Write a protein that binds this ligand. Sequence first.
Ligand SMILES: Nc1ncnc2c1ncn2[C@@H]1O[C@H](COP(=O)(O)OP(=O)(O)OP(=O)(O)O)[C@@H](O)[C@H]1O
Ligand SMILES: [Mg+2]
Ligand SMILES: [Mg+2]
Ligand SMILES: [Mg+2]
Ligand SMILES: [Mg+2]
Ligand SMILES: [Mg+2]
Ligand SMILES: [Mg+2]
Lengths: 154, 1066, 116, 112
Amino acid sequence: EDVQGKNCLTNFHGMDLTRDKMCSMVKKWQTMIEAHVDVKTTDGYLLRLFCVGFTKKRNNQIRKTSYAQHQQVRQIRKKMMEIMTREVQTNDLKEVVNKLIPDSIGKDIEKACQSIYPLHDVFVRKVKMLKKPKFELGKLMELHGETGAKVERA
Amino acid sequence: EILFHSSLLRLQVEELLKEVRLSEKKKDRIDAFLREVNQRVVRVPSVPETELTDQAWLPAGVRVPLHQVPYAVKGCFRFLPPAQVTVVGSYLLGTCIRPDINVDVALTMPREILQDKDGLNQRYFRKRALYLAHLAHHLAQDPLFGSVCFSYTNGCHLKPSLLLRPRGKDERLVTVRLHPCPPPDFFRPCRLLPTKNNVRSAWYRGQSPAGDGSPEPPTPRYNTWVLQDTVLESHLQLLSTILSSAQGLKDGVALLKVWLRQRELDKGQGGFTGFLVSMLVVFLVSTRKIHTTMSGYQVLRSVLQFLATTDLTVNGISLCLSSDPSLPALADFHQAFSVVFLDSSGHLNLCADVTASTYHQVQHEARLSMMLLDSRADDGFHLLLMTPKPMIRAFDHVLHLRPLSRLQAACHRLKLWPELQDNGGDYVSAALGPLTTLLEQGLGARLNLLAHSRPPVPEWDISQDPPKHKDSGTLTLGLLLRPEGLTSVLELGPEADQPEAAKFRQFWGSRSELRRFQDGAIREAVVWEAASMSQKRLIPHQVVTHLLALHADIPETCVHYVGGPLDALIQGLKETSSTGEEALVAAVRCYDDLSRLLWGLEGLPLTVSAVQGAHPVLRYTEVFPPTPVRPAFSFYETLRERSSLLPRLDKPCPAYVEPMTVVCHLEGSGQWPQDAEAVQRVRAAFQLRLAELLTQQHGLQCRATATHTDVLKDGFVFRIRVAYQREPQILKEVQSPEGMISLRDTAASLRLERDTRQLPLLTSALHGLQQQHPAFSGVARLAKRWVRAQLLGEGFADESLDLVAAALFLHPEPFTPPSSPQVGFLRFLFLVSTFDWKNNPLFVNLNNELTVEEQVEIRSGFLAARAQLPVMVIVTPQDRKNSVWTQDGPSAQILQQLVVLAAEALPMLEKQLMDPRGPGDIRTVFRPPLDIYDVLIRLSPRHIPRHRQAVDSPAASFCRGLLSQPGPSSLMPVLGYDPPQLYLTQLREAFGDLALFFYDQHGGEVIGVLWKPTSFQPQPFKASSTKGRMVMSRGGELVMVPNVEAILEDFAVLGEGLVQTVEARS
Amino acid sequence: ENVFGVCHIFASFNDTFVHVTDLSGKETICRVTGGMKVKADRDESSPYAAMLAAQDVAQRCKELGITALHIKLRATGGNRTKTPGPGAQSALRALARSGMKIGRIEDVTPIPSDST
Amino acid sequence: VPGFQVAYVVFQKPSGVSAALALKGPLLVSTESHPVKSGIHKWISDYADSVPDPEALRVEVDTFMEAYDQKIAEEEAKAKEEEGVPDEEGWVKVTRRGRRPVLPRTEAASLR
RNA sequence: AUUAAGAGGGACGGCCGGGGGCAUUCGUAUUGCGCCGCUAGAGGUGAAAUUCUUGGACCGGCGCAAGACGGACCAGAGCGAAAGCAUUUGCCAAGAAUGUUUUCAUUAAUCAAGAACGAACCGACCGGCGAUGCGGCGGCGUUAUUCCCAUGACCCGCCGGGCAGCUUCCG
Ligand SMILES: Nc1ncnc2c1ncn2[C@@H]1O[C@H](COP(=O)(O)OP(=O)(O)OP(=O)(O)O)[C@@H](O)[C@H]1O
Ligand SMILES: [Mg+2]
Ligand SMILES: [Mg+2]
Ligand SMILES: [Mg+2]
Ligand SMILES: [Mg+2]
Ligand SMILES: [Mg+2]
Ligand SMILES: [Mg+2]
């Protein structure tokens, strides 16, 4: 975002999950539910978050298929949208990333959906910005912590 | 309904029109007055021909109103009765504004008393001046006129005017201005071009009569004034044909005057008068832009559109329909005048006195009004037309030029000799133009708009010399700071290689210097010395001081910059560098570090889900920001059982430390108890665990309490509260006797929801707002200081004052968002004094989140249930249908007291800043009376930690037990220990039902006690009411009164030592 | 410490490209193809041609102070093959022979999801 | 914080109560043998016992939690015995512990 | 006239489905365009040759636009009279089965004619056993939990109507 004399000062731009990890979770005898939301932070940052989850087979289960019905999927999806929405628009950009580094959103989603259908491998797989606020120098200053040099006239 | 909204709009227009117009009965007697004046003026004696130099014929008691600086003339004077008497102006046009009614009368000069060459060397102006003088002598003795005076017509010092007013009753309704005018076709229009001459240099300045030299400079302003008298009747004739026929056009014209009046853009010399917009609407009728079937509101809608979109200083417009080959070109007028308008006669600029800065201010005001009109919302009519806009309340900083005589020297340094010759001897109006032009270029990046005050039109009585240019008034400049660009402390020029660098070196002089930067470029640059953001807010003061000294020879002593004088009220005893935002930033960064430490702590059974701050410090609303502290060991006692200190009995009270509240939420789980008191047991255990883990992993001093944990980090003390999500729900469980378990709101349930959910949201919401508006913190802290200084701090919550302060930055519809603390404070007092809280709720649109459809719905609900709401209601998107922040807020009685105080404190504070001399005492509005209170108690300064926060600095301080050397601390200081607050709680608990106690939390040395009249009347023996009451037998029956003499000695016993003396009156 | 770079190795059956950029991948350091070293169209994708391509780039990074590389192996992708070409192995091996430090390797072959 | 207060006083025999009723004196609270504590110095002393003992707090928190849990457990054990088992006059009590979901007895559910 | 068919029609109850119609939205890939970096080639074959390139092709980065398509999850599963049906959300109408101590009371079946729609070994041969999809009933236990939204996930027994297997019995 800004250069300060041989020190490139950066900011968060987006988040993504690796290809191999993404391929490994998607198994064959389970159902995957996906959702996306557009949420604006308190400091004006607009985000698009993607979440993915997979149904879990119980320990004592004998049925080979662990499939969720359509209404249960929508009920699971509706909870996912509400949790991601509420956890971003209340906070700012700094707080969200601190939540995102250990993925506190995914664990909170997993616990809330146990009543509808048990889930595992719940993650926020991708984060995008659609709009950025006007660049202000002071806002960058707390993230990273001139007049010039005098030359004699001839 | 749209019809009802139009109905509300039309009635608002009509009720505004009626109050600003004049009654029929008042018209009739004014018609009677002018008939008497016309009868009086026509019978005047004549005088024989005399040389214009000889003025001995005039009697003592009358003086010529011109100053006649070059006394040598080449003309003769004869007086004759006026040939024709004509009433001109807007009286017969039907557009007169109520506060000032003026009727203009034109006196047609006889031809036989004027000469062909009277248009040169001020001969016409001199002869006109003495004609008025002879009339004034013969009209003063008449008993019809209550008062007769001299003044300037059309704002010209070379064109005096005569004032006549009636006697006894009816004295103020109308005044008559007498304007002599030459014969219709006496003068040649071709002789009065802006490029032609009428004042010869030999007569004006030279001693030789025919000294050869350069060609005579053109005199455009002189030519305009002479032609101005000749076209008096033509304006009235044109306006009668176009404007008199169609109603609604007058309504728009009358509405335009009110708009100009409110924004102070009409009065003064060179002001945008209402005469101008009357010609402007005539020009608009000539086009297709306005048609005669328009109504009054749409005309103002139409007219301000033209002003906001047309820049007339570069593209002039003409009212002349004819296009002759031999007609003057608009290019010549642009070289002569800054603002170029035209009439049917092209020679008449009609705008020769308005400056470019004045026109730019009009365009800026027009643009702001268009946004309000384009938006559809309630009270837009009120904000547009009945909200006054004083220059002090419309600009962040103001600047005074105290000696106007020094401006004459500025004319000497610059080259205005042809301009000073053209306008007579008015050096003030000559140098007003270029000086503002010089400053706007130097402050282009740091300013949005520059404005200057206009000299008022003087009025002096007969037998007194006319006022001079030096004592005309005081010159004041208004600055509108641009929020971006104030962060930089440099003005960057071009590189030294290209030759425009030399031009940069000329404008800045020695302060222009070479600099190199990390980008690799050598550049001319000027560097100021500004460390704090408040000092950066005063960078234009350094700019204006340097440029006037270099380019005008105007010393710094002649400039009085009024910028941030109130900043001392929210500062230390002697610390003027910063207003405290720097300390606010340091505390915020420490909180972020603590949040990062908590976000990552290991060993908790449940991990942290959310961290939120709920303190005024974290939202930049703390009046006195805290600093890291190190307690003194020998000043204290130490338990040695924990690392906590104890205040000493012989030493004074220690320094005050207030912890910051931080709300923490853990992971949701189903192992929490479903019992109200059992959750209290788990929460307290979590306090113990959190303190134990914190001191082990990071070595921080942590004290565990059943409701909170106090943590000392980097010299700051934070109070950590752990909350549980479903606890408010559990408190709402109420099993009914019939057998149903329901959910009902409870005062305990409402309180917990406020401290853990509502409070963090506002703190986070206002914290982000400070980022867009850096001036929000200063306004809010000054707002709190004023209220707490008026002893009305009790009852007013901290968050409530923040919301009204935030309302200024979010809804400044008449104004622009504030950029200085002082301008927001003035708007704060205006809002409190003038808002109708009874019938209107205050909206705080934090980050939008509310549309107009919702807002009109909520206002509809506001009026339907006003009784259940508090007397003051503030609406936020998060806190809607109610204002939890004022449910326990101030009562109606102390509400009206603040409104009276706010209405009282505003004027002299406005006068103090507008005074060219320095303000005598900024603290006058910060001192309470101490007269109405029955009992006054004085407290010892020894036991008040918050004594440096007093409005009046004591200049002597006690030792509070702090270490100057920064560093870590191994022992906890005492948290939140101040006897004045402990003393008040005891007083309000025992004697709350009997008296009211008033105190100032910042340096209060006196407590105001006011008795309750209803409690002091005799009452029957009620066992619950026997608190402090004794039994009488004065009437033979047992009744109750508070025991006053025992109460007074309770005041001394309670608070022993801290209380010094108690005095009772009446 | 080690100065790191990003090395793009496109390995088609027809030709082999070795391309080194910075960490952001926007600034180009050096790019050599199989056609630069062998003067024959048969051998442009041959493993020997790739080895010469890797050696030229590796020595170029040395004079710039670049010591370690991140590797992005990429095939032609799309509807065509998703197998690295013959030049992929030798150019990868020759980079380690010159002493260039090896960071993480990743395949960035564009994989379509919907068949055309 | 105390204000004006009321008092209940018990004596050994009723004649002492009559002596209290017939008592007449100034009743000095503070004397030299037993001074009665007030003022700034008192608030320091009230700050002294305001210090909590972490060991005492933990024991009471454990003791209250130790006492709480068996009551929950005893109710659960009693409920499991009472689930089903119709009583005399053949009334069967609807509980949440059966396999058929039942409508909660709450005002919110009734309105829905 | 009576009953209310393991004949039929209708209502009611909670669910269920790539069934249909209208809007709405997201995702890579590919193609083209704009700008930045770099410099002789790039592409294709069995070998080449058509083509593109110093006015910068190919490759690396950022963004924009357009046309298709909807993987993996995806099953011999589901839905529809058939042909056929797969991103998200909102709206409109319809339907199967199940549940029913509701209602009408023979209103029914098969059918040339006629009408709507329409890609591009053998036979109603009684049964059985396992799974599987939907609805319902009963249950020892685990697993979450309900301000709103929601009352489920698993195991066992049982009843129907379906998509199909492995087997028998009868003509
Ligand atoms: N710039 C000007 N050029 C020419 N004439 C002018 C100028 N300014 C004022 N006048 C003359 O001044 C005379 C006095 O009327 P003026 O323009 O002051 O308005 P007014 O009667 O005070 O009206 P209102 O109440 O509407 O403001 C008019 O006849 C007008 O022609
Ligand atoms: Mg007038
Ligand atoms: Mg039947
Ligand atoms: Mg149905
Ligand atoms: Mg449905
Ligand atoms: Mg459906
Ligand atoms: Mg089932």
